[PDB]
Amino acid sequence: GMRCNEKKKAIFGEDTLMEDHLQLREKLSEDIEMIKASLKNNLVCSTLNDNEILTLSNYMQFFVFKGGDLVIKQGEKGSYFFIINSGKFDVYVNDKKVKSMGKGSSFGEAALIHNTQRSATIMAETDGTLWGVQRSTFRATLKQLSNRNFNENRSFIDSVSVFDMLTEAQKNMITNACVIQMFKPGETIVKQGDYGDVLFILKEGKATVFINDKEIRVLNKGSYFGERALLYDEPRSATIIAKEPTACASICRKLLNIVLGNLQVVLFRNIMTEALQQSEIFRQFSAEQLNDLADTAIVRDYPANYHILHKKSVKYLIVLEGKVELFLDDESIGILTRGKSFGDQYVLNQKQKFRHTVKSLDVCKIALITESCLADCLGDNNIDASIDHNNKKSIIKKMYIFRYLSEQQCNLLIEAFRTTRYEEGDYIIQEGEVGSRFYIIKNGEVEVTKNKRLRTLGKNDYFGERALLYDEPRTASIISKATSVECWFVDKSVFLQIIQGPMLTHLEERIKMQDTKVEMHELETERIIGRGFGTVKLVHHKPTQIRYALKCVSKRSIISLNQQNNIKLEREITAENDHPFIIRLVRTFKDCFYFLTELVTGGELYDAIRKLGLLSKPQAQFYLGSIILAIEYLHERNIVYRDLKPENILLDKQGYVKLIDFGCAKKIQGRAYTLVGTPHYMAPEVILGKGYGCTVDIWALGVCLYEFICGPLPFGNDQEDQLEIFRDILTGQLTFPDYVSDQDSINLMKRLLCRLPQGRIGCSINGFKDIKEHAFFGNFNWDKLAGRLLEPPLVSKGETYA
Numbered sequence: 001g002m003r004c005n006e007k008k009k010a011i012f013g014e015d016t017l018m019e020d021h022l023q024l025r026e027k028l029s030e031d032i033e034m035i036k037a038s039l040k041n042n043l044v045c046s047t048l049n050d051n052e053i054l055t056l057s058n059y060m061q062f063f064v065f066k067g068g069d070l071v072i073k074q075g076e077k078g079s080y081f082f083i084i085n086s087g088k089f090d091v092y093v094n095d096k097k098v099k100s101m102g103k104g105s106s107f108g109e110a111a112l113i114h115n116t117q118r119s120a121t122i123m124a125e126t127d128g129t130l131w132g133v134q135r136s137t138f139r140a141t142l143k144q145l146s147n148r149n150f151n152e153n154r155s156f157i158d159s160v161s162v163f164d165m166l167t168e169a170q171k172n173m174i175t176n177a178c179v180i181q182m183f184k185p186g187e188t189i190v191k192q193g194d195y196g197d198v199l200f201i202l203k204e205g206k207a208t209v210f211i212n213d214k215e216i217r218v219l220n221k222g223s224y225f226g227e228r229a230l231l232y233d234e235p236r237s238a239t240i241i242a243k244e245p246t247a248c249a250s251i252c253r254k255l256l257n258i259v260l261g262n263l264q265v266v267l268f269r270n271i272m273t274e275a276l277q278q279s280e281i282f283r284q285f286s287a288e289q290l291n292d293l294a295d296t297a298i299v300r301d302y303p304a305n306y307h308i309l310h311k312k313s314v315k316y317l318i319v320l321e322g323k324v325e326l327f328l329d330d331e332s333i334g335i336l337t338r339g340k341s342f343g344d345q346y347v348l349n350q351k352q353k354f355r356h357t358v359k360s361l362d363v364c365k366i367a368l369i370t371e372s373c374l375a376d377c378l379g380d381n382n383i384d385a386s387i388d389h390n391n392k393k394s395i396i397k398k399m400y401i402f403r404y405l406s407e408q409q410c411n412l413l414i415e416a417f418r419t420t421r422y423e424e425g426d427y428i429i430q431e432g433e434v435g436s437r438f439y440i441i442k443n444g445e446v447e448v449t450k451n452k453r454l455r456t457l458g459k460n461d462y463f464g465e466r467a468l469l470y471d472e473p474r475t476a477s478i479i480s481k482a483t484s485v486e487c488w489f490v491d492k493s494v495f496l497q498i499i500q501g502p503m504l505t506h507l508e509e510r511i512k513m514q515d516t517k518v519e520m521h522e523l524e525t526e527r528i529i530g531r532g533f534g535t536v537k538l539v540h541h542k543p544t545q546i547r548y549a550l551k552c553v554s555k556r557s558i559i560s561l562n563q564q565n566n567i568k569l570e571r572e573i574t575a576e577n578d579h580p581f582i583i584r585l586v587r588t589f590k591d592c593f594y595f596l597t598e599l600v601t602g603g604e605l606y607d608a609i610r611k612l613g614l615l616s617k618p619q620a621q622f623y624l625g626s627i628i629l630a631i632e633y634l635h636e637r638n639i640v641y642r643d644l645k646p647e648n649i650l651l652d653k654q655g656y657v658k659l660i661d662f663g664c665a666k667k668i669q670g671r672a673y674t675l676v677g678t679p680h681y682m683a684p685e686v687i688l689g690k691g692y693g694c695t696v697d698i699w700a701l702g703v704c705l706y707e708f709i710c711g712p713l714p715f716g717n718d719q720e721d722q723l724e725i726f727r728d729i730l731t732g733q734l735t736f737p738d739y740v741s742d743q744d745s746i747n748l749m750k751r752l753l754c755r756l757p758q759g760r761i762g763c764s765i766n767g768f769k770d771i772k773e774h775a776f777f778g779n780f781n782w783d784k785l786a787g788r789l790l791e792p793p794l795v796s797k798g799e800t801y802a
Contacts, residue, residue: 014079017070018063018132025062031085032057035131038083038106043727044113044142044688049180052145056133059141063130071130072122078111080132087128093120100125110723112138113687114675139689143673146690150671153178153249156201162227165267170260173765176758177255183207183242190226192239197253199226205246210239218243230256230263259758260765269294272367275318275341281348281387284394285377292377298368302360309358313371315350316343322364327357335361347374350383389414391460392488395440401465401507404580404786405499412498417488422480428487429478435467436492439478444485450476468495469508502654502788506580513586513598516544520589523550529801533557533663534592538599538801548586551595558593566663567593573639573662580786581630582659583650600658602651603800609646612793615708617742619793621780624705626657629786631701632768635694640668644700645681646707655792668693679725680713684755687726695757698771702752709745710737714753730755744776 027035035057039045045053060083065071071082071089084105091099091107098120101107110116112135154175157163163171181200183189189207190196201224209216216238219225228234230253253263260266272294276282282290299320302308308324309317317324318341326333326342333356336342346352350371371383378386392414396402402410419442422428429435431450440462448455448463454476457463463478468490496504523539526547530536534552541548558567574595575585586596602608605623609615615623627649634641643664650658664676671691683699685692706714715732716725734753736746751761752771762771772782784790 014072014076015134018080021063021065021069021130023062023064027058027060031131034085034104035060035083038104042106042112043109043730047688051180051182055145056138056141059137060131060133063132065124065128065130067124067126067128069124070121071124072108072118072120074118074121076118078108078116078118079134079136081108081112081138082106082122083131085129085131088125089128089130090123090125091120092123095121111135113689113726114722116722139673139675142689143691147671147673149180150175150691152203156203156222156224156249159222160199160201160224160227162230162263165270167270170266170270170765173259174251174256177251177259178249179252179255181248181250183246183248185242185244187242189240189242189246189248190236190238192237193235195233196226196236197229197233199230199251200224200240201249203247203249206243207246208241208243210241211237213239229253255758258764265295266765271320271339272297272318275339275367276316278339278341279316279344279347281344284391289377289390293369293373296373296376298370298373299365300368301365302363304360304362304364306360307357308360308366309354309356311357312354314343314354314368315346315371315374316369317341317358318367318369320365320367323361324364324366325359325361327359328355329357343369348384348387392417392440395460395462399462399465400578401468401511405503406783406787406789408783409498409787413490413495416490416494416498418490419486419488422485422487424480424483424485426480427477428480428485429464429474429476431475431477432473434471435464435474437489438465438468438495439463440488442486442488444480444482446485447479447481448476449479456481466511468492469504469511500789505654506788510584510598513546513548513584516541516546516586518543518548518587518596520594523548525550531802539596547599549597549599551597553593553595555592569667570662570665571595573665573667576637577634577662579630579633580788581626581657582633598658600650600660601653601799601801602655602794602796604647604802605649605651605657606646607800608651608794609708614711614739615793617745617776620705620708620745621777622785622790622793623657623708624701625777625780625782625785627659627701627704628768628771630657630659631697634665635697635767638668638694639665640672640692640694641665641697641700642677643681644697644704645678646704651792651794651796653796654788655795656788679722679729680716682726682729683757684730685757687730692757695760695763698752698760698762701762701771702749705745705752706749709742709749710740714749742776744774744778748774748776 032054036053039048039053039056045056048056062085065087067087072080074093084101084103086103089101090097091101107122115135154171157171157175163174166174189200192211202219202221204221206221207219209219219240225238225240229236230251256263269291273287273290276285276290276293297318319336319338321338324336326336342356342358346354374383375381378390380386393410396410396414402413405413417440428439428446441457441459443459445456445458447453448457464474466472467474518541522542524542525537525539527538528535529538529549530551534554534557537550537552539548539550553567558564571588575588577584583600584598586598588594588596612619627644631641631644641659641662641664643661648659648661650660652658666672671693673689673691675686675689677686677696681700681703683692683696686696703714714734716728719725719728734750736749740746748761754760757763761774762768764770781790
């Protein structure tokens, strides 16, 4: 009997105590009504409907205690929330008796929001029992309720035909406008003849339809009605009455108009945008431009066999319904069905005579875009020139170098483009030579080469942009690899006449820092500039003499709080950020993790506002405006920041802002539920645990504006206890001091600090447009902000760090 000659591995606070007291107990009517009563008064649960509270009530657990047994200690980490069922319980703060609690009373309120160290000890005087629930269970139950409600409502949005032409984002936005409405047997949901404006969808139960007091049919779960009442003012065709207990998801037109705008206008824009984008011309148009074409297009119904067009200043034609046949003279050239379109030729050549014929094959609906309709869309009568102008604008607005310049700067630059032609085999650029030109390929193809082939570029690609910022050797060659290639080009001399010093300095310094492929051994630490988490060192790169910042995240710090999956997700977000008002990552290192970023030398915004005192309107516009662009950028990439506060905003050498610290930031996929952020800045929806998204940063924006204009924080300014901060956030009164003289500032603050996201400015389908166009910003040039053409509020004299 031989043995195994290997080896075999071995195996190895408040929740432990409540386990000793837990017992099974069937809940009666009297128990449920007590729970229901107690939760209706609770900070988080007061807004919840009966079915939500009844669900939460069921997850409560029975805990039996003897007189003298410990329930809660003072200084231990909190977790349970309690409702006293029987007996008496005494509260001893600092080993000193204060209150005596009995049947109906509650304690451990804060535990339902976050892990908090308790204040006092609760002891049991007589033999008594508690109804209890943990945080985990409570937050999980609130998550599941709201999340399933949302998913169920969205499926019903999908089953309703009138919403078919809404986008993903539009459907998700109106899913939140769904209100659940309960009807007992006998209750009439809608009555024949009433001008109602509400769609209804049966989740569970059945309801009977009555036209003229006569039963037509019965309606089962999934059946819906009132979709026409979201579009038009019309009487109800029927009287719908509930047969059994029924739950209805409902959408009112009033809320839809707030959230989405006019539903007919939005649907048509989507239909028209999709059609117009089939043409290569209108793909380059902006969303606004296409929306304008949709709003002003002439819509017409034609009978069959009608000459819609023959030999009229129509340039483009879209089939909304039916079929039309296209003719060149007597030759049929094709049939256009629903969604197809015609007119590329005439859109591009404004003055060209319409040579084609369009004839309806059946009864049809057609959208027509005229010459005036394009001119109004584009802002001038020279359609051919504007389309060319915009084609170029679309190309350069994708490049960092050009996309943040003012519109006036961008227009002048486009106008300065000159065209040249090349024979096949011509070196457009030769490597090693010093360039002074930026190129965009109009026609043909080119080959990028070095020392062998690297790439191939064609129509609307670009190259050589670095020559506008630097005097350096071309790292590659550009050989014309086609028949007769044409490039648009702009000279450096022209670029330098258009761009001004501050923007040029920003670009010079920013594009350079990707070139320096640094290594850890090439960095020398000058001084420390931050502490924590870890430490931030100012470092000096020996080869290039460029100065950087080096954050030092410790391994033992990250592994302690289990932030394993969060540091990798943080690196991803931080690396992808490429906006002028967001910190730019250079590279990372490991051995402790490291972030190498650009050096920001003008200190925190926390200190700047404290140097300035109360900000004037122009100063608040500048800083809040700057934060808006950074936050907008992140929201467009589905990133919620979650920790917006002045501490997390640095100022650069020129006085422009840099958003830092993306530890709390997250790539949003649906509704987020985790409680993160800094309490004073946290949005109500985060605290209430029913789901949130990018809208939280807009609340935070409001908190910042309040600090800027008013001085103190709007909620919990005096408070240190986190429970009392959240309370003031949830139910406190928003007030403004007597020295705040600006009506528009207060209006904006109130609407940014709207508790429910649906009524919050910037949280509708228009997004930040509504914030940017608010009267507070009436005299504010957003165009000049991004391009660094505004005097900032404060310019730092020398460098400044914490």
